[PDB]
UniProtKB/Swiss-Prot annotation:
Its main location: membrane. Residues 316-324, 386-396 are cytoplasmic. Disulfide bonds join 238-268, 256-270. The chain holds residues 258 to 802 of 835 of the full protein. Keywords: Calcium, Cell adhesion, Cell membrane, Disulfide bond, EGF-like domain, G-protein coupled receptor, Glycoprotein, Membrane, Phosphoprotein, Receptor, Repeat, Secreted, Signal, Transducer, Transmembrane, Transmembrane helix. It comes from Homo sapiens (Human). Broadly expressed, found on most hematopoietic cells, including activated lymphocytes, monocytes, macrophages, dendritic cells, and granulocytes. Expressed also abundantly by smooth muscle cells. Expressed in thyroid, colorectal, gastric, esophageal and pancreatic carcinomas too. Expression are increased under inflammatory conditions in the CNS of multiple sclerosis and in synovial tissue of patients with rheumatoid arthritis. Increased expression of CD97 in the synovium is accompanied by detectable levels of soluble CD97 in the synovial fluid. Residues 345-363, 418-434, 491-496 are extracellular. Residues 92-286 form the GAIN-B domain. Proteolytically cleaved into 2 subunits, an extracellular alpha subunit and a seven-transmembrane subunit. This is Adhesion G protein-coupled receptor E5.
Amino acid sequence: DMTFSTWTPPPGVHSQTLSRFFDKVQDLGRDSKTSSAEVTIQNVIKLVDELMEAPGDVEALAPPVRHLIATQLLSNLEDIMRILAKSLPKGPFTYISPSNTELTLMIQERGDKNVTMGQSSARMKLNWAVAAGAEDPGPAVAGILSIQNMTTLLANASLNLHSKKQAELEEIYESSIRGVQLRRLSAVNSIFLSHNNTKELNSPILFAFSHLESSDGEAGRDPPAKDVMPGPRQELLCAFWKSDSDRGGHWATEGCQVLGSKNGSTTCQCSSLSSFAILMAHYDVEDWKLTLITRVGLALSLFCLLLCILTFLLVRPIQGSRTTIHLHLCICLFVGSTIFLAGIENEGGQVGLRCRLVAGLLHYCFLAAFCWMSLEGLELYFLVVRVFQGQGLSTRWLCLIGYGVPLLIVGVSAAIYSKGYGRPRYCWLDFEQGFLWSFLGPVTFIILCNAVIFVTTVWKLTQKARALTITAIAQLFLLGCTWVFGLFIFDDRSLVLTYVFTILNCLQGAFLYLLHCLLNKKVREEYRKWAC
Ligand SMILES: *[C@@H]1O[C@H](CO)[C@@H](O)[C@H](O)[C@H]1NC(C)=O
Ligand SMILES: *[C@@H]1O[C@H](CO)[C@@H](O)[C@H](O)[C@H]1NC(C)=O
Ligand SMILES: *[C@@H]1O[C@H](CO)[C@@H](O)[C@H](O)[C@H]1NC(C)=O
């Protein structure tokens, strides 16, 4: 037969088990027969099977060395199959190893017929023109090899993501990717033509790769594979093995695309030919998490609001409409901050029911606190207009307005934009599909109402209540500034605006407690009465 290639380890690599494998490869190639060429190919495949079954000291090597060895082994297997392919007559050649390694070969004359080959692991529909070769005048050579336990060699493999592929993935996930963990599905490991120049195809070729299930039952009787449910943080790879100058080799996905997956199969279309395999690759991505600074600041604001609520609940001299409004505004702020601490973080998952509920209650607590501030302004207006006679406004109407107007707004918005609640990064509203206008509508309308109320109250007072109007205006400004800076903490790469948001929460709690409780004299007298 024709001269066989000498199989050598990669330079600088020492391994006794691999040397034992290559010595048998060389001796078999020395003693191979023309009628045993396809036997020689199967024997080489069985030697690969034994090498997998006896990993030895290969795993003790560096991963880049192991990947380089695996690339060399698959390349040599392609070379020896190509060499002995011309030694075989025309026709298909299909063999299954006792270690369940499938190899398909096919020899036909030159032509442009659409040829669909494959038995179990894969189905390759290719144009036969490229199988003949650009310069080879002999019969066309093409084949597919599938080996199941490259995990012996391809452990902790690396995936090189293309720049535009990274840009698309980060647009999909809306932040950076730490890395990729690779879990393959198929045993397909080699697709080759007659000539070695298969780096580019003038026409894409379709493949139907099936993924074997490692069942412990009788072989050949298993049903077709059940489809794996795709998760949020994972997408399906029609990948190939490409050598690398720095780490031996890596997985790559460019030039290939996914078309569908059913009956235990995945349909891929590729612009080139190489070692193809289907990966079920989970992407490791960091999730936006509140910093310790922000958590401590929110805890301090919660403490201040708790002191406020206890004071407004227990100090009996100060009971009134203003105290009721401050009580309920502090309650809404406390509940909103508690929900923010407990559920703004989305721990690297999809937008579930809990995340959507957290976004809904955050919006409700927002609108309720804002409407209770508006109620405080409205009662100041009513007090000034009636020239301080009184009777206020009943707490039942106050609780209807400040807890039902937000309920109506949130219910309507969640009935229209149910998909706009919760994001994969944080449990807060998403402003796509015109949700920004529908969210700023009620907010800007109540801002306009508050501004009208405050300017009318100031105008009426110009013709102790001016101090209350100033305090209400400053409190509204502080709450609005806190919320506005609470919307830009998620976007910013450098969390310097989170410092401002934390400081604004701290100042909001301190402002409420100082102005409404500490600077109050009846509150202090009640405090010393309790502490006596
Ligand atoms: C493949 O063989 C390795 C040992 O070399 C073993 O750890 C692994 O579980 C096997 N996997 C399958 C699917 O046989
Ligand atoms: C990746 O390699 C590390 C050792 O660096 C090992 O602890 C870990 O189990 C490996 N994980 C996979 C999926 O190979
Ligand atoms: C393959 O699955 C589809 C449903 O996705 C089913 O309609 C079809 O009958 C199945 N065929 C085989 C051979 O399992």
